[PDB]
Amino acid sequence: MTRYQNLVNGKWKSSEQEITIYSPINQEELGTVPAMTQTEADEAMQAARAALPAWRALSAIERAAYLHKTAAILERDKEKIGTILAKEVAKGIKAAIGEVVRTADLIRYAAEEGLRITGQAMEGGGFEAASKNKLAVVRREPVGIVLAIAPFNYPVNLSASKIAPALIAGNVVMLKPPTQGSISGLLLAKAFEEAGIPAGVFNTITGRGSEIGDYIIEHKEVNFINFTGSTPIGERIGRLAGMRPIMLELGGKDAALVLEDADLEHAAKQIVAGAFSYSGQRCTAIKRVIVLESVADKLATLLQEEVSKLTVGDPFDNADITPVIDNASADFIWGLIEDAQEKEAQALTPIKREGNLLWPVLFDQVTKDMKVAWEEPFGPVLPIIRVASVEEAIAFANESEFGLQSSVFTNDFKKAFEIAEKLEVGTVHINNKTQRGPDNFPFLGVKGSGAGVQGIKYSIEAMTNVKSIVFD
Template identity: 55%
Template structure:
């Protein structure tokens, strides 16, 4: 029998203020998290700073064993966590269940990868004027206290993608989940602690970002910030910190470029899956189609066919693809983009309907560059088609965006695929596939306003460590 998530009210204390967490599905209260104060933040950071003194010296194999155990415990609770993901962030069952499994795999791979990261020795005589009497031992050391800030859409996976590499590298962590997603964050911290993490190594900070967000990111004892969220908030963080390394995954306006020789049925299937799964509430969702005009009509036929297969509704009642958006504010914003496109002459192919926070999958044709939906990230189920006359026009339109996370190119010609890929200003180009994150050991990054630094298991570990050189002089 599937285990359901039930909030444990016995943990509540009379002397603490709490924030209600409401489900985006029906606005019901599903739990409470502490509304922490600046004093609470100070305490969490202090605990992390003190715990770092011991944790950094714990042998790597011991840290790895804790991570392996955490992965096992995560899977032991997969049914309850899947249910919580569905209720708290509105995910469908398949996506929620997959997130837990993927997270367990991520934790294990992180521990495995850390064991294979080695230092090096450098001989002095490889540089002019020096000899073998001088050499350097180069090692990697933890940076200290890492602030991990996760978004609502993958509250377990994207939190773990920050926490696990930080811990295995010997850092301690202050973890600030998005307010919607905090219940998942609380459960995640409990599981890591149950796996054997010493006190203070992983510390949870909950509450409204408007009250403690600026304070925690600018705290003087934070040594590294790992953030996933909107470009607006990411820019704000970068303006507030000084001499603190940043690793940030921000917004995107990922384009699917469809050339005239593409397998259109295959392209349509990938594009619709990439655009509308979890209602497009993903940074890597396909957010616009740039298609060569001579095949646009045929592509739209296939797109329509794929959209008709999508299931829309309440994820607690049936398996669905398109779910209610995370908030009324989010739904309002998507409808603004839809209305703007209509007013400026875009052709509505399908959708445009709203029921509460549920917006039906929406496809526009003949979208022009003066329309907001051509440039703004909707984080919702609306997909604009911009027709182009050439490959170079598609590249130019793709690169004109302020974002640079990912793009897809669909073509049967590998030469054309490389031509496009080499000219796109993005972190990743997907050839004949939807834009997506993963596999998790691949590099994942954005350029321009889509991010700073490179994620991916090995890359994240290296980002949250620093190089240290110890120079040995034998001619003393």
């Protein structure tokens, strides 16, 4: 048995109690991570508070050098990290190695982007002539101790997208890796520690949501909460964070609005790739197709073909559809499928289940009464909703309680721009699948899909405070 331990104040620490992690594919005992106690979690935050000053007292280029060394150590260990990440969140082996290398690239970009944050030198005289001799120098300072909470679906990539923009800002961070995927967060901590980052600048917390989960969020040293997860927990984090600054990125039901003049082969390929990447267990995925009744039949057949050519197996065979993360989620997916299937929705793809591994289901003839039309599954299920006009498509898309992303497949671009401006959403992709995209691109969700704006530049900006120095 491999026993992993938390990085606290530059040191490795085990707790009295431990948590054992099991593969979502084999249920094989994968390792063990410590289960910390409220007191051991205070010690970690006191270490962070004590390491804050000497760390934000460095120049940006030195801590950027630390980040670059971490990225190099990550990239040389891509297979070692990737195989256990694949084992732990049931991800394809090429996909896991891919996110490790994409994480290294994200860390490099964040290091060189937080290294160029310039301020302002505002003047006074265009507002009043009595304040004409007052220059204000508006620079930007770290918020302090940033607590990053990572999702299971990307334990290395979303955690790093939280860590690195904080660290380059002069900002001490504490990571809480998810319960399923804590080994990956601890391997990221291993890379950070081997890079030589000072003691207390990067710390990890592992435990059970019952003991230290809400305690670390409501702590006084914590200055910024950066959370990725689902809306039930995001609502709590928003309510009990207080007046304190937060960044939440919760779920979404991204719609693929397909119109009359649309390249339906391109639309079908892009929709299936987006919808069934990582079994649909990703927040930025197409989770409903809203297509006009004129082209809906051609689109349905094309989608059926694309979904049929998807391989459904083991992660290490690089299957397209690997088993979902646990049995509770598979039960939720099966409930959504049963509700849709008993309400007379034609299933264009076979519906079958072997434990966690459940087959991609493509539903057609979906109405407003089936729950698969409204709820985010995180499973390989894709409803097809048929509407009469583009106005009904806009109304149906905007009737969701979520608003991350959308796709507006069409051929007229003034029409796509009109539709994109009418969609209550954060990002509109025209003629493409929804992505978190190049990570310089902004990433946000509106309505109940999040709070704050992600992306490297905006993440670096958000975990900082502006300070004006006003003189004559």
